[PDB]
């Protein structure tokens, strides 16, 4: 699991830098719209994972 | 044998009760159910499901090419690859089925830009993993099989997982999403 | 800030960021011809499913 | 809540079933008796002097 672990972490640190170099928002307001598209996301892993 | 003689299996053979392989058959009959939440419809979920072999094949090849068998150690290492692969697929199919209900886009639309957005994380995650698990696909001291049995089913996996996930997953998306 | 993906600069990541930003695109749209004719993957499937 | 499940009526059935499933599953693995064990435990010593 030194991986599923990593692609929970990497899939949220990327997905804001990726919103900031497309929308061009402040770090905070993107890490918010970003997490808004991966809410229910971490709910099929958390479910399917188990 | 002569009447009056009979037999019994003991210990390493008796085991145990109970014990059935339909565990995974009830697992797989609820990973449907979980996705039917995430992705609004009953018809969609198949998009991530169909992934699952694109993962095992490479891991099986990697074991068969190294000449190591179906352990528990390979067997768990399979299950990490069946989920890591299907996690990545969950993100692709999510972004797609959102950057067309939020944005409101055409029928094919950014199923492409879904795979575009996600290609950067999917690549560096699997790069890190295959790199971190490297020395434990050779290592060969103590646990020279134990540790070696762990990596080979991942090595072969995350190789087959990502290098097919990019391609087959939007096939699986568009095929199915049209079909109903 | 909007648009930015650092395509060239001082360190050996200018070398790289242009390199990955090249590699992405050369195999971004290669789904295109694939998705039009699904069939030649949809039964390449069964070759790997078996 | 109920408005949210009218908003997502699919989650609804995969909560009903996810219950019925991993509940009715319990009825495969549940002790069946008559009345629960109410009578107080009793140890008996026995011996025999021929």
From Swiss-Prot, chain C:
Location in or out of the cell: Cell inner membrane
Induction (free text): Positively regulated by MarA, Rob and SoxS transcriptional regulators (at protein level).
Disruption phenotype: Loss of susceptibility to contact-dependent growth inhibition (CDI); inhibiting cells still contact the target.
Residue ranges annotated as Cytoplasmic topological domain: 1-38
Sequence intervals crossing the membrane: 39-50
Highest rank taxon of the organism: Bacteria
Any coiled-coil regions, as ranges: none
Disulfide bonds, paired cysteine numbers: none
Subunit structure: Homotrimer, with large domains that extend into the periplasm, interacts with AcrA and TolC. AcrA may be required to stably link this protein and TolC. Interacts with AcrZ. Part of the AcrA-AcrB-AcrZ-TolC efflux pump.
Family: Belongs to the resistance-nodulation-cell division (RND) (TC 2.A.6) family.
Record function comment: AcrA-AcrB-AcrZ-TolC is a drug efflux protein complex with broad substrate specificity that uses the proton motive force to export substrates.
Protein name as catalogued: Multidrug efflux pump subunit AcrB
Species of the source: Escherichia coli (strain K12)
Residues of the whole record sequence present: 501 to 550 of 1049
């Amino acid at each position: 699991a030194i991986g599923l672990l990593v692609d929970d972490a990497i899939v949220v640190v990327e997905n804001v830098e990726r919103v900031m170099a497309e929308e061009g928002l402040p770090p905070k307001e993107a890490t918010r719209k970003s997490m808004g598209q991966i809410q229910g996301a971490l709910v099929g892993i958390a479910m399917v994972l188990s | 044998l002569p009447t009056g003689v009979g037999y019994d299996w003991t210990g390493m053979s008796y085991q145990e009760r109970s014990g059935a392989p339909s565990l995974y058959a009830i697992s797989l009959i609820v990973v449907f159910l979980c996705l039917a939440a995430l992705y609004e419809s009953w018809s969609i979920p198949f998009s991530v499901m169909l992934v699952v072999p694109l993962g095992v094949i490479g891991a099986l090849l990697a074991a068969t090419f190294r000449g190591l068998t179906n352990d528990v150690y390979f067997q768990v290492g399979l299950l990490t690859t069946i989920g890591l692969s299907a996690k990545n697929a969950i993100l692709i199919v999510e972004f797609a089925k959102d950057l067309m209900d939020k944005e409101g886009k055409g029928l094919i639309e950014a199923t492409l830009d879904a795979v575009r957005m996600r290609l950067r994380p999917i690549l560096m995650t699997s790069l890190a993993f295959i790199l971190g698990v490297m020395p434990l696909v050779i290592s060969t001291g103590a646990g020279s099989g134990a540790q070696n049995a762990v990596g080979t089913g991942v090595m072969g996996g995350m190789v087959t997982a990502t290098v097919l996930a990019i391609f087959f997953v939007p096939v699986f998306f568009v095929v199915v999403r049209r079909r109903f | 800030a909007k648009g930015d993906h650092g395509e060239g600069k001082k360190g050996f990541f200018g070398w790289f960021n242009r390199m990955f930003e090249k590699s992405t695109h050369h195999y971004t749209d290669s789904v295109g011809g694939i998705l039009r004719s699904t069939g030649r993957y949809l039964v390449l499937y069964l070759i790997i499913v078996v | 809540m109920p408005n949210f499940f009218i908003d997502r009526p699919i989650f609804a059935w995969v909560i009903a079933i996810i219950i019925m499933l991993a509940g009715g599953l319990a009825i495969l693995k549940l002790p069946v008796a008559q009345y629960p064990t109410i009578a107080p435990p009793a140890v008996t010593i026995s011996a025999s002097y021929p």
